């Protein structure tokens, strides 16, 4: 038998994305953030194309399709970035883009050093936990179905069904090569725990970007069109508690 | 949301 699911995830996995950052200029907060915002914009495009091509994704109500994307983009991009950092530079730095790699010095200048160390720890997790390329792909797909609005979705039933299936596929990935149900359970524990630790980080980044937007005109930080729109219309909903993450643990 | 919508629409 062949893995139809994993073949799809592997096939739709977006390629390298550049930030268009001028590494010839001395570092500065304005330039670093303004570049991260541009990077975010670019990656968003790929995140849309990626998601639209996910198994059973089109079964979701068109409105819910756009919603889960606007709520989880952060966690998805942070998770994907933590993985590039582990596979490209063995977590020595934050590999946001080939043309935008952060060392402690840059983490500091970005004024979000603590958050960055958080992401470095996340990057190292892929190592200590020995996260296979396949487990990663499935984990990322799942993060798109990890943050729902308290008032519920247009069609909350479909989402629950879809999300369920992806968890079912993650059970298969873990079940593969593992014959004992205890090690299967023990592994699910670790992955779900790892997937949860992504939310606190996303939250901090959500809050940080939110404030940055409000005082952007004062600190000379440029926000791309969509970025500003999402952060001012969707992000606030998460920060105000109207939209919440789905943790596996408490 | 109005810009993300157009992006979403045209893939
Ligand atoms: C999602 C991005 C950009 C894509 C990525 O690899 C992860 C990274 C996490 C920090 C985000 C950044 C986009 C721009 C943001 C939102 C800044 O405004 C502050 C936090 C930045």
Q: Tell me the structure's resolution in angstroms, rounded to a single decimal.
A: 2.3
A223: left (phi over 0), alpha (psi -120 to 50) or beta: beta
Q: Do B4 and A65 touch (CB under 8 A)?
A: no
Query: What H or E segment, with its residue span, contains residue A166?
Result: helix A156-175
Q: By the 8 A CB rule, do A101 and A89 touch? A: yes
Experimental method: X-ray
Mutate to test the interface with B, among A66, A70, A149, A233 (most CBs of B within 10 A): A66
Interatomic CA distance for residues A240 and A109, integer angstroms: 28
Buried b (16+ CB within 10 A) or exposed e, A208-231: bbeebbeebeeeebebbebbbbbb
Residue A69 and residue A48 in contact, taking contact as beta carbons nearer than 8 Å: yes
Q: Which helix (H) or strand (E) holds A45?
A: helix A29-52
Which residue in the set B4, B8, B11 is minimally distant from A229, CB to CB? B4
**Do the beta carbons of residue A122 and residue A29 sit within 8 Å?**
no
Partners of residue A44 in chain B, C-beta under 8 Å: 4, 7
Q: Are strands A243-245 and A147-149 parallel, antiparallel or unpaired?
A: antiparallel
> A70–B4: do the CB atoms touch at under 8 Å?
yes
Q: What is the token pair recorded at A249?
A: 């643990």
Contact predicate A243/A152, CB 8 Å: no
C-alpha count within 13 angstroms, C-beta hemisphere, residue A83 = 22
Contact A38, A99 (CB under 8 A): no
Q: Please state, in angstroms and rounded to a whole number, the distance separating the CA atoms of residues A6 and A138.
A: 8
Residue A183 has which token pair?
A: 């090690």
Q: Domains in chain A and their CATH numbers?
A: 1-250 (1.10.565.10)
Q: Give contacts of A229 with chain B, Cβ < 8 Å.
A: 1-4
């Amino acid at each position: 038998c062949q893995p139809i699911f994993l073949n799809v995830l592997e096939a739709i996995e977006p390629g390298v994305v550049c930030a268009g950052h001028d590494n010839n200029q001395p570092d500065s907060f304005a330039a670093l953030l303004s570049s991260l915002n541009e990077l975010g914009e670019r990656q968003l495009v790929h995140v849309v194309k990626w998601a639209k091509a996910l198994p059973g994704f089109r079964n979701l109500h068109v409105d819910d399709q756009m919603a889960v994307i606007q709520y989880s983009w952060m966690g998805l991009m942070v998770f994907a970035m933590g993985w590039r950092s582990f596979t490209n530079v063995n977590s020595r730095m934050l590999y946001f883009a080939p043309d935008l790699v952060f060392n402690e010095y840059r983490m500091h200048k970005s004024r979000m050093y603590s958050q960055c160390v958080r992401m470095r720890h996340l990057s190292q997790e892929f190592g200590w936990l020995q996260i296979t390329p396949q487990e990663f792909l499935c984990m990322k797909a799942l993060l798109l179905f990890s943050i729902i609005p308290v008032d519920g979705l247009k069609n909350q039933k479909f989402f629950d069904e879809l999300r369920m299936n992806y968890i079912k596929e993650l059970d298969r990935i873990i079940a593969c090569k593992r014959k004992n149900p205890t090690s299967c359970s023990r592994r699910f524990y670790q992955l779900t725990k790892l997937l949860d630790s992504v939310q606190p980080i996303a939250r901090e980044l959500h809050q940080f970007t939110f404030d940055l937007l409000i005082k952007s005109h004062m600190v000379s930080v440029d926000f791309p069109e969509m970025m500003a729109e999402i952060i001012s219309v969707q992000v606030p909903k998460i920060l105000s508690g109207k939209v919440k993450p789905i943790y596996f643990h408490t | 949301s109005e810009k993300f919508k157009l992006l979403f629409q045209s893939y």
